[PDB]
Amino acid sequence: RKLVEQLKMEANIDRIKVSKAAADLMAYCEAHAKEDPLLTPVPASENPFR
Amino acid sequence: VWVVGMGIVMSLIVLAIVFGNVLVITAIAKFERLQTVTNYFITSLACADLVMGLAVVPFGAAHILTKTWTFGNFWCEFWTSIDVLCVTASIETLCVIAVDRYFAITSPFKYQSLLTKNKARVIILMVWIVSGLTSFLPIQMHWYRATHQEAINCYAEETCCDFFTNQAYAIASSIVSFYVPLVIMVFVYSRVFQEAKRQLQKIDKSEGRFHKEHKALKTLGIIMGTFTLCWLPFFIVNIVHVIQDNLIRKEVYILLNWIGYVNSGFNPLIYCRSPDFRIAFQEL
Amino acid sequence: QRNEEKAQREANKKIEKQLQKDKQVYRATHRLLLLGAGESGKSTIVKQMRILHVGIFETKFQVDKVNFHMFDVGDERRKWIQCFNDVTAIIFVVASSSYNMVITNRLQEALNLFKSIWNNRWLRTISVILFLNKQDLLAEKVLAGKSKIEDYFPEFARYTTPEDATPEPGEDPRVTRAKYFIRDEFLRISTASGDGRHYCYPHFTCAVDTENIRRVFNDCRDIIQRMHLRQYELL
Amino acid sequence: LRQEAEQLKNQIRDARKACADATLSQITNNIDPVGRIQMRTRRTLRGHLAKIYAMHWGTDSRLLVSASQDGKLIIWDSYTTNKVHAIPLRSSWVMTCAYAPSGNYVACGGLDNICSIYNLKTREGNVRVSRELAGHTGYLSCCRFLDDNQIVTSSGDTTCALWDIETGQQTTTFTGHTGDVMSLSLAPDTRLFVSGACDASAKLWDVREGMCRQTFTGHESDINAICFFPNGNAFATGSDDATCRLFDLRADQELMTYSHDNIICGITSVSFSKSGRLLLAGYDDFNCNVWDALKADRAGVLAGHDNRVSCLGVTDDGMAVATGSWDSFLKIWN
Ligand SMILES: Nc1nc2c(ncn2[C@@H]2O[C@H](COP(=O)(O)OP(=O)(O)OP(=O)(O)O)[C@@H](O)[C@H]2O)c(=O)[nH]1
Ligand SMILES: CN[C@@H]1CCc2c(ccc(O)c2O)[C@H]1O
C-alpha cells in the first residue's frame, strides 16, 4: 500500500550523465587543491601543532 | 696455551650478559603496554644483571688472565664492594617476584588493592638499600678483614687481589644473601602448586566425561632447578672453608663463583617468555 | 598573556587529581551481564539479589566488602553486544521446565541463542554462568505421566544417567535423569569449542533459593583465579 | 500489489544504466598521482579510563570533546594538551557525542535511549543537564546539531527524528528503514542529510519536507559510517566488508569503489579532506588507511594505535586529523 507509492516518486526524477558529474568533482578538486594543508605540507613556521 | 682459548669463551659471557639485558630494558620503557607492576621488578633485576656484566665480570676476567692486579688496592676493594652489592641485590628480587605471584594467585580479590605503583617503588627502594647496607658499609669500614699473616701480607701488597674474611661476616653475608630468600621462595611456590592442583582437580570433576598437572610442574621446576643449581653449590663452600680451613682449594672457589655468575645471563630467557615480549622483540 | 596560562594549569591539576580517586573505584569493581530468553525469570533473580544486599536496568550490591555491579539489557541481530567484551562473567538464565511450549520449542530457541552467544568474535574470553531456572515445575511435569520428553526430544530414548551423577536428597530417579539430560545438552556445546580460554558453570536454581549470591561469588573468584593461573602458565 | 512494486523496480535500473556514459576511472586516468603521504603524531592525550566510542571537533578547531564508556565526557585543548572540563554521566554506556556550532552546548547518548544536553557557558561555573529528550525505543547511534535549538538523532529502532531543545518534543520523524540506523551526516547548508542502516542501504531525507528522496544500494553487509563530499553533491560510505564506495546524488548511482584484496577487516569510520581529494577510513585491523578520491590508490598508513580505531575527524581548517581507539588514547596527526 504505502511501499508501492514510494518508488513511484523516485522513479520519475531528473538525471544527468556520469561524465558531467565526474568533470564537476574533478574540477572542484583541482580548483581547491591549492588551499589544502594535508596535500601540500605547510611550512614549519606556521604549524600550530609543531 | 689453554688460557688463550679460556679467554675466548669468557668474552662471549660478557657480551651475552650485556646483549640479553639491554633488550629487556628498552622494550619495557619504550612501549607503554608493558608498563605494569611486575615489570618494575623485572626492570630492577635486568639493571642489576647489567651492572654485573658491565663492571664485575670484566675485571675478574682481566685478573684471571694477567695473574696480577694493576689498578691498585683502593680499586680492588671498590670492585669487591660492587660485586657483593650486585650479587646481593639480584637474589632478593626473585623473592619479591615470588611473593607478588603468591599474592596474585592466592587472594585475587585483594590483589588489586594491596599492591600499587607506590608500594612497588617503596619495596624496590627498600631492597636496594638493604643490599647496599650489606656490601659497601662492612667492606669500606674494614670489618671483614682476616687476621692470619697471609691475609695481612695480601692487604699490604699493592699488586695482589684476593678475598679473606672472618667467620662472622661470611656467615652473616651468606644468611642475608641466599639462605633467607630460599625458604620463602620454596613455601610460596609449594602453595602456588597446591592451588593449581586444586583448580585442575575441580575442572576435571566438573566436565571430565566430555574431555595431569604437567604444565605447572615444568614451569615451577625450570625456575627452582635453575636458581638452585646455579647458586646452591657456591653458598656451601663459602661457609665450609671458613668453619674449617684447609679443606677446599682456591680453583674450586673461583669455579663455583663463576658458575653462580651466569644466572644473571640466564634470567632474561626465563622471565621474558611472554607473547607481548616476543612481539616487542620481533618488532625490534 | 602569561596570566591566563597560569590559571589554566590550575584547572588541569584539579581534574587530574580527581581522576586518580575515580580510578581506584573503577579498578576495584566487577561487572556482570544478564542474558536469557523471555519469560525465563531474569528479573526474579534480580529482585532477590537486590533486596538482600542493599532503558537499562542496573543494580549495585556488596558481598564480603567486594563491589559488584549487575546490569540487564532488555530482538535478533544484536549489535550492542560488542560493548560487553570486558565483563567478569555472563549470567545466562534458561527456563528448563518449558520444553513442551512453542513460541519451535522454547528450549530449542534457548539452545540456539546459547550457541550463537558462545561462538562470538568479541566474546571469546568471557566465561558463562548458567542458571537452569524453574526446577519445581519440571519436577512436577516429570512426576506425572504425560507429555513425555521423548515425544519432543528423540535423543532421550538412548540416554542413561552418568556414573558421576550425584542425586538430589530424596529425589525420585525419574526427575534426575531429565535434569542431567538437559544439563549435558547445554554442556556439550560449551565443551565442543573454547580452546580453554573460557569455561561454563552450571547450576540448578528455583524461585525461592537463597544461595544464588554465594554461587555467583564463588564462581567469580574461581574465574579470576583461573585467569591468573593461565596468564602465569601455571595451570 | 506485489507485482506492481517489482514493475517499478525494473524501470529504475533501466534509467540508471542509460546515463552511464563512462566510468570515473576512465575520465581521471590522466591525473597525476599525489604520491606518498606520510604524517607524524604531534600530540597524545591521556586521561581516559576505558574505551573511546565518540569524538567531535569544535568550530574553532582548537577544542574537541571525547566520550568513553567509563562514564566521562572530557573536553580537551589540542594546542596545549590541557583538560578544561570533565562531566560525570549518569549512564556508563555512551555511544555518541556532539559539539555545538556556537560552542555553548554538548550532547550525549547511548544505550539508555535518552539524549542529554549540557550547558557549558553557565553562571556559577558548574555544568548541569539542561534537557533530557525521550521518545526513542532503541539505543542511540548518532546525533548532530543544526543550531542552538535543533538536533537530529538516529536510534536503533529503524527511525530518525528531529527534536526541539526548548520544548523537548519531536517536530518530525523519518521512517522507511528496515534495519538499525548506524550513522548520519548533515549537509553543509543543513537542508538535507543521509543515514546508513544495517540493511545495506542509504537514503537522502529532507528536513523541511520530512520525506525520503532517493535510495542507494550496492553494499553486501551492514553500513557503519557515512560522510558528505565538501561540495555537497556526493557522499562516501563505509561498510564492514572492507569496501568503501562513492555515490552521486545527481547521477543517482555508484561512482567508484575503494577495495583491496589484502584487507578483510571491517570499517568503523570515514572522513574527507579540506579539498575533498583524500578519503581517510578507519579499520578493525588496529590502523588507518589513506585513499585517493579520484584514483583509488593507497597513499599512506597510520599505524600508531594498539587497538581498533572507533572514531575519526578532520578540523574545519583542514590542519590536523584526530583519531580515537579502544586503548583510551587520542592522537593528532599533521
Ligand atoms: N511457580 C513458579 N513460578 C516461577 C518460578 N520462577 C519464575 N516463575 C514465574 O516467573 C514470573 C516472573 O518471571 P518472568 O515471567 O520470566 O518475567 P521476568 O522476571 O521479568 O523475566 P523476563 O520475562 O525475561 O523479563 C513469576 O510471576 C512467576 O510466576 C518458579 O520457580 N516457580
Ligand atoms: C669475591 N666475590 C664475592 C665473595 C663473597 C660473597 C659474594 C657474593 C655474596 C656474598 O654474600 C658473599 O659473601 C661473592 O660475589
**Structural domain boundaries in chain D:** 42-333
Q: What is the number of the ligand closest to the CA of B135?
A: 2
Sign of CA dihedral D216, D221, D225, D230: negative
CA angle in degrees (0–180, nearest 5) for D131-D137-D143: 50
Cell of D19: 546515463
Say if C10 is an interface residue toward chain D (CB within 8 Å).
no
Instruction: Give the Å distances, CA to CA, from D205 to C121, D174, D190.
Output: 34, 8, 11
Position B232: which residue type? L
Cell of D231: 561540495
d(CA C89, CA C224): 10
d(CA B127, CA B105): 23
* For testing contact with chain C, the best of D68, D74, D92 (most C CBs within 10 A): D92
Closest to D161 in 3D by CA, of D147, D172, D146:
D172
In 3-state terms, what secondary structure has residue D286? coil
The domain made up of D42-333 has a fold known as Methylamine Dehydrogenase; Chain H (2.130.10)
Give alpha helix (H) positions in chain D: 2-18, 24-27
Strand D243-248 versus strand D234-239 pairing type: antiparallel
Put simply, the answer to whether C234 touches B208 (Cβ < 8 Å) is no
The best mutation among B238, B239, B240, B258 to test binding of ligand 2, ranked by most ligand atoms within 8 Å of the C-beta, falls on: B238
Put simply, the answer to whether C55 touches D84 (Cβ < 8 Å) is no
Please state, as a whole number, how many other Cβ atoms lie within 10 Å of the Cβ of residue B119.
11
The residue ranges of every structural domain in chain B are: 2-283
* Contact between residue B280 and residue B34 where contact means Cβ atoms under 8 Å apart: yes
Atom of ligand 1 nearest to the CA of C207: 31
Residue of B nearest to C199 (CA): B203
Class of domain B2-283: mainly alpha
Q: How many residues in chain A?
A: 50
Strand C66-72 versus strand C57-63 pairing type: antiparallel
Buried b / exposed e over D255-265, threshold 16 CB at 10 Å, is bbebeeeeeee
d(CA D265, CA C146): 53
Nearest CA to ligand 2 atom 7: B84
**Structural resolution in Å:** 3.3
Domain A1-49 part of CATH 1.10.287.950 = no
d(CA D291, CA D287): 13
- DSSP-derived letter for residue B177 is I
Strand D159-164 versus strand D169-175 pairing type: antiparallel
Sign of CA dihedral D255, D259, D261, D265: negative
d(CA C173, CA C170): 9
Q: Is B83 annotated as belonging to a binding site?
A: yes
Cell of B16: 651475552
Close Cβ partners of C147 (under 8 Å, ≥ 6 residues apart): C100, C141
- Which experimental method was this entry solved with? cryo-EM
Closest to B105 in 3D by CA, of B26, B156, B38:
B38
Q: How many residues in chain D?
A: 334
Sign of CA dihedral B253, B258, B261, B267: negative
Domains of chain C by start residue, with CATH: 1-235 (3.40.50.300)
List D residues 251-270 in contact with C (Cβ-Cβ < 8 A).
Answer: none
* Contact between residue D324 and residue D311 where contact means Cβ atoms under 8 Å apart: yes
d(CA D6, CA D200): 19
